[PDB]
Amino acid sequence: SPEQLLPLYPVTATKIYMNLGEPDAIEKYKDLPFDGIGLMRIEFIITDWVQYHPLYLIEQGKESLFIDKLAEGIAKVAQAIYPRPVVVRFSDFKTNEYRGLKGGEKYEPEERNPMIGWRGVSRYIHPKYEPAFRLEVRAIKKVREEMGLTNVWVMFPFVRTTWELERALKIMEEEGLKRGKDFKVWAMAEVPSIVLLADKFAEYVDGFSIGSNDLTQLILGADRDSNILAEMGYFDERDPAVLAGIKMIIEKAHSKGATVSICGQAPSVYPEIVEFLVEAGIDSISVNPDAVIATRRLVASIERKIMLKRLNKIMDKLNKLEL
Amino acid sequence: SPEQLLPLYPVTATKIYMNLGEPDAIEKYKDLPFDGIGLMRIEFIITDWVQYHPLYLIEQGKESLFIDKLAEGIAKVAQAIYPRPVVVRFSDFKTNEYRGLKGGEKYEPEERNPMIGWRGVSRYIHPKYEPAFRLEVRAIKKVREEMGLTNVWVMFPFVRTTWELERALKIMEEEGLKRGKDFKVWAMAEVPSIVLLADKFAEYVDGFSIGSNDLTQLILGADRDSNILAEMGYFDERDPAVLAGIKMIIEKAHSKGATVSICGQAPSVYPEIVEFLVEAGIDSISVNPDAVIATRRLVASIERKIMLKRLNKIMDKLNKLEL
Amino acid sequence: SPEQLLPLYPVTATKIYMNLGEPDAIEKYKDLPFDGIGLMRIEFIITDWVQYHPLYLIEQGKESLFIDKLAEGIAKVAQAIYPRPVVVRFSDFKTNEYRGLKGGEKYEPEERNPMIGWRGVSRYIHPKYEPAFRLEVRAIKKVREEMGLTNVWVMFPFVRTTWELERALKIMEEEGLKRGKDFKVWAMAEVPSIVLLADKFAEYVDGFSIGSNDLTQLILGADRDSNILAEMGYFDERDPAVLAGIKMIIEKAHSKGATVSICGQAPSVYPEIVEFLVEAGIDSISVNPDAVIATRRLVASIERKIMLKRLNKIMDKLNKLEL
Ligand SMILES: [Mg+2]
Ligand SMILES: [Mg+2]
Ligand SMILES: [Mg+2]
Numbered sequence: 001s002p003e004q005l006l007p008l009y010p011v012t013a014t015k016i017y018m019n020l021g022e023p024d025a026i027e028k029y030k031d032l033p034f035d036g037i038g039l040m041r042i043e044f045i046i047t048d049w050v051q052y053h054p055l056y057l058i059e060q061g062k063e064s065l066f067i068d069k070l071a072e073g074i075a076k077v078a079q080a081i082y083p084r085p086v087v088v089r090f091s092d093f094k095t096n097e098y099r100g101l102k103g104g105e106k107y108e109p110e111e112r113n114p115m116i117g118w119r120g121v122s123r124y125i126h127p128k129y130e131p132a133f134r135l136e137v138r139a140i141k142k143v144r145e146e147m148g149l150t151n152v153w154v155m156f157p158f159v160r161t162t163w164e165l166e167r168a169l170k171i172m173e174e175e176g177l178k179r180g181k182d183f184k185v186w187a188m189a190e191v192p193s194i195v196l197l198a199d200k201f202a203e204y205v206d207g208f209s210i211g212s213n214d215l216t217q218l219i220l221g222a223d224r225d226s227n228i229l230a231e232m233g234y235f236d237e238r239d240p241a242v243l244a245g246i247k248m249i250i251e252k253a254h255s256k257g258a259t260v261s262i263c264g265q266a267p268s269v270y271p272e273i274v275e276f277l278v279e280a281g282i283d284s285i286s287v288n289p290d291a292v293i294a295t296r297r298l299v300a301s302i303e304r305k306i307m308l309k310r311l312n313k314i315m316d317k318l319n320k321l322e323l
Numbered sequence: 324s325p326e327q328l329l330p331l332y333p334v335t336a337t338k339i340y341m342n343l344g345e346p347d348a349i350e351k352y353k354d355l356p357f358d359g360i361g362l363m364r365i366e367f368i369i370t371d372w373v374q375y376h377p378l379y380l381i382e383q384g385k386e387s388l389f390i391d392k393l394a395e396g397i398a399k400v401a402q403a404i405y406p407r408p409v410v411v412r413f414s415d416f417k418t419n420e421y422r423g424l425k426g427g428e429k430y431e432p433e434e435r436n437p438m439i440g441w442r443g444v445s446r447y448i449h450p451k452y453e454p455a456f457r458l459e460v461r462a463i464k465k466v467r468e469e470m471g472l473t474n475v476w477v478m479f480p481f482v483r484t485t486w487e488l489e490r491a492l493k494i495m496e497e498e499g500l501k502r503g504k505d506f507k508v509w510a511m512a513e514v515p516s517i518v519l520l521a522d523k524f525a526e527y528v529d530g531f532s533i534g535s536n537d538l539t540q541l542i543l544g545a546d547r548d549s550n551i552l553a554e555m556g557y558f559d560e561r562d563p564a565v566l567a568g569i570k571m572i573i574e575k576a577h578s579k580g581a582t583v584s585i586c587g588q589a590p591s592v593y594p595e596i597v598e599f600l601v602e603a604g605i606d607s608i609s610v611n612p613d614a615v616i617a618t619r620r621l622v623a624s625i626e627r628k629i630m631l632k633r634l635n636k637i638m639d640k641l642n643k644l645e646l
Numbered sequence: 647s648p649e650q651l652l653p654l655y656p657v658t659a660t661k662i663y664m665n666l667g668e669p670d671a672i673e674k675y676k677d678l679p680f681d682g683i684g685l686m687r688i689e690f691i692i693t694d695w696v697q698y699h700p701l702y703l704i705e706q707g708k709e710s711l712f713i714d715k716l717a718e719g720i721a722k723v724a725q726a727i728y729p730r731p732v733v734v735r736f737s738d739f740k741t742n743e744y745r746g747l748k749g750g751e752k753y754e755p756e757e758r759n760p761m762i763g764w765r766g767v768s769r770y771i772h773p774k775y776e777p778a779f780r781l782e783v784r785a786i787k788k789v790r791e792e793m794g795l796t797n798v799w800v801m802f803p804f805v806r807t808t809w810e811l812e813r814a815l816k817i818m819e820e821e822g823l824k825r826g827k828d829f830k831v832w833a834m835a836e837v838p839s840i841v842l843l844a845d846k847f848a849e850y851v852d853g854f855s856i857g858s859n860d861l862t863q864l865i866l867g868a869d870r871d872s873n874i875l876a877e878m879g880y881f882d883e884r885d886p887a888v889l890a891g892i893k894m895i896i897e898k899a900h901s902k903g904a905t906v907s908i909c910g911q912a913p914s915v916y917p918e919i920v921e922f923l924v925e926a927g928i929d930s931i932s933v934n935p936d937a938v939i940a941t942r943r944l945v946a947s948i949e950r951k952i953m954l955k956r957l958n959k960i961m962d963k964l965n966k967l968e969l
Contacts, residue, residue: 007356007616008331013628035624083592181561181595281635303631310634317641436761436869445868445875483866483880484887514867515838516887519894523886541867543806544837545768546759552768557806563846564807564839571842 009033017286023073036084038286039263054132056103070139120158155186190214202256212264237266332356340609346396359407361609362586377455379426393462443481478509513537525579535587560589655679663932669719682730684932685909700778702749716785766804801832836860848902858910883912
């Protein structure tokens with residue numbers, strides 16, 4: 001009877017979140033010791049439950065279908081784990097991925113580098129895609145209000161500049177979705193501009209989610225699907241530059257009182273990444289379901305280890321005071 | 324076999340108490356990891372096991388029935404969880420609620436605001452209701468002595484002034500119920516006078532129980548059953564005024580060496596309230612049975628988190644000493 | 647010839663304001679040495695000059711009558727004592743008191759506790775009563791502009807939360823009534839939330855008016871018309887909790903540069919309350935007309951006494967510097 005084994009799992013100061021892409025998979029992982037969904041991917045919902053470009057649906061006057069499918073998926077995930085928070089990520093599609101949707105060829109220009117192209121918040125605040133972002137915000141508002149699921153938060157993927165973030169925030173406010181005590185807004189820390197200006201971005205969002213997969217790619221300026229670059233071992237999240245960027249993000253966000261989360265494959269595979277993150281004082285770690293329990297163990301041990309080490313340092317520090 | 328799973332639950336520095344209103348429900352929740360009954364409501368016993376106003380029973384010479392029913396309920400609850408403490412709350416009825424009892428129309432005046440009317444300690448020390456309070460104290464004494472259940476403590480609901488508290492204490496002493504090492508007396512911190520003078524009230528009671536439901540109502544001056552006020556969102560226990568009052572109560576009580584408890588719906592629904600309470604250093608948290616286990620998890624995690632944060636602060640503090 | 651005796655009255659640092667409920671009574675008390683009307687009650691105007699619920703008049707399209715009667719009363723009071731300020735209090739009625747008006751049964755729900763019910767700013771910002779508050783603001787604007795009576799200020803009764811105060815302020819701004827150098831906005835400090843967060847409320851208002859009558863009731867959680875509670879002596883404004891709350895309000899408001907006033911029966915009857923208020927450094931005291939002159943004497947003496955005591959302390963303090 002595993003359902004009574006949940007409270008007996010090790011207690012961790014750092015929150016252990018879970019990454020979810022398919023809403024129907026929430027019932028498979030309902031017995032895992034996770035403190036919430038730190039990353040809900042709505043890409044699967046749009047691809048397989050909608051099949052249509054949101055702008056195409058707006059042109060055909062079918063906003064209701066898109067809004068209702070997103071609302072159904074998000075409400076299922078939120079109600080399955082209430083009151084644990086569900087951090088829904090906005091549309092993370094690229095232009096080429098957007099073209100895969102039905103009727104998306106008319107609204108998606110052919111881009112040489114969609115990886116660093118028109119995507120994320122830059123797409124949301126643009127007048128062309130603004131109605132689709134408004135549809136997504138309307139779905140989130142319907143989940144939070146019609147179903148009363150307060151535990152639904154949002155994260156803005158691929159945030160580039162502060163003014164774009166504030167424009168997205170005011171667009172959300174125009175839709176009645178306002179940042180508050182019961183509503184948290186996060187920003188993906190996958191762009192080096194966020195690394196350099198995390199303390200400046202913290203005035204607009206409640207916290208940051210470090211997209212280590214994309215953050216490593218952008219910091220190193222390398223793209224993963226290129227087999228040549230992958231063979232050389234570039235895409236190691238243990239890279240000193242990536243670690244320095246993560247440390248800077250954590251320091252700036254905690255100096256401005258913003259929470260820091262990480263949602264990538266780095267904590268799932270590399271224990272040393274987890275140790276470094278916990279030592280830096282990261283607020284939460286979001287991992288894949290199959291890596292939840294182990295992470296909950298590992299973080300706990302690391303915390304205990306830290307709780308020893310700091311004590312020693314304090315004593316040593318105290319020694320230098322008396323001499 | 325859940326009965327051997329009790330010792331395996333997470334260990335929390337803050338005591339996790341349980342709220343009980345029906346004595347017969349103690350057997351349903353005997354397998355929950357609670358450190359005691361932080362709030363036992365005798366309102367159900369008087370309403371459904373007595374059906375009669377205590378003053379009416381005194382007039383009819385039936386004090387024995389009221390005393391014996393209270394003693395039976397309290398003894399059942401205390402013996403079910405011995406030696407864990409059972410904090411019995413005295414009669415928390417309002418005048419309109421008192422009139423619901425049989426024969427209570429003759430003893431309860433019609434009040435415009437019973438919510439802030441003749442209730443609580445103000446009712447107990449009044450000569451008219453003093454015999455009923457003496458009956459309640461006699462029932463408590465019978466439980467503590469005839470059945471030898473030392474684990475029964477009392478809390479005074481809706482305490483307004485220090486002189487009324489000392490008059491209630493001397494009335495209890497006249498009945499042979501004296502505050503001591505084996506008997507704890509608490510005061511409900513649901514009136515702003517307790518907020519302002521907690522350090523003064525601490526000389527009379529062993530600890531305080533924060534009635535967050537009533538404390539929010541009195542601090543904000545709003546009454547919950549009014550749907551208009553509820554719709555505007557006034558009754559949020561995360562309100563800055565309520566948090567400041569709770570912090571002041573905790574600080575004053577710990578400055579005077581008195582324990583602090585909370586028995587309301589705030590810790591059951593809002594994790595941030597629990598985090599703030601544990602950070603402030605609250606001695607115990609009393610929640611509903613269905614919210615016990617989760618709270619025991621949450622508090623534990625928060626404690627661990629705090630146990631990290633303080634360490635960091637100490638190191639930072641130590642840094643400022645060397646420079 | 648008493649009219650030349652006004653300048654010969656004792657000079658007080660603390661402003662001595664007067665409480666007025668009937669505009670026609672301003673001519674009776676025009677020869678009293680008061681520095682202004684610290685509390686103008688428009689309850690009498692609405693009850694006896696309008697007789698109608700403002701929402702009922704709006705439904706019947708008779709906003710002009712209500713606005714003109716309020717304007718006539720306020721203009722009479724302001725012109726009678728120009729340029730001394732007239733602090734008009736907004737509608738302080740309760741729901742039961744509102745039902746006494748003609749046609750008010752349809753707009754006032756039956757409330758169990760109107761004393762802590764839908765009243766004050768909570769009523770003004772609500773969409774249902776918002777047109778009536780707009781009518782009151784329009785009357786104030788007509789007095790300040792059509793008659794050019796700059797000396798008219800407003801106070802918001804029964805302020806609960808900061809967001810409600812800012813919503814009322816923006817509603818006033820939408821009506822052209824904006825806080826400025828020639829227009830002062832006060833908040834009644836009769837709710838314990840104001841006591842706990844006076845420094846936070848000071849960013850929205852020019853000053854605070856301590857409603858000691860209601861402040862004592864809310865701090866002690868007792869209602870005055872209950873004869874049982876009154877007999878026990880609960881409603882003593884010399885209570886330590888009420889004094890501590892008043893001291894906290896004064897300290898916070900003066901730390902944020904906001905003026906503090908008191909408009910209640912405490913300074914009219916208890917000289918020690920006046921002494922404590924003047925020692926705390928209250929900016930003004932508003933009393934009943936029959937208690938004006940005596941208060942003007944008493945405060946003066948107290949000020950002189952303080953002006954001695956502080957000097958002694960300074961000398962003593964200086965002694966500790968030389969030793
Ligand atoms: Mg990404
Ligand atoms: Mg209560
Ligand atoms: Mg009042």
